[PDB]
Design a protein around this ligand. Structure first.
Ligand code: CU
Ligand code: CU
Ligand code: CU
Ligand code: CU
Lengths: 70, 72, 72
């Protein structure tokens, strides 16, 4: 069953937000929906996959993850 | 009253880096009378009545590394 | 004589990051004869007489992460 996670990630330019998009996009179709706002610095993910698995994938980009939740 | 001149050597690699610093500083008008950011020289010059530390902390909320700062 | 070819996987996120890498390596001309940088593939190709670990260090100094490096 599809779960919903939201991370608060420090993204400064459109390259930062693109980099996060990129790694989530590789997880399609297990990620069914991606929604990112540079300006509010938020990342929303709809997937079947574990929080912990998505937390790591996103930090791998080297962008600071301030906070998470489900 | 007195306008202080501060310089920061801030790690800034694209114009997002430098724009994010810019944005936090412009928020502090009317107490900032001049902001000179040079993305090319990785320098941030601020003229302001505010104390150094308060300015420093506003810059660091961007997440960009501040290599050094000084009051001129 | 040898003109050596090095390839590094470097975490370049926007064209500021790749441009930061390009600038450190163009400061090494003409010892560096050719530079091909691929933002897309995250790769930096250097043709040079300088030794491998000297080029590696220069790229590290930019602060962008180097995942891997090799001589071909
Ligand atoms: Cu950028
Ligand atoms: Cu960026
Ligand atoms: Cu940047
Ligand atoms: Cu960048």
């Amino acid at each position: 069953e599809i779960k919903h996670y939201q991370f608060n990630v420090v993204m400064t330019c459109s390259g930062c937000s693109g980099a996060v998009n990129k790694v989530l996009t590789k997880l399609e179709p297990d990620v069914s929906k991606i929604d990112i706002s540079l300006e509010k610095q938020l990342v929303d993910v709809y997937t079947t996959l574990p929080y912990d698995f998505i937390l790591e994938k996103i930090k791998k980009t080297g962008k600071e993850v301030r906070s998470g939740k489900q």
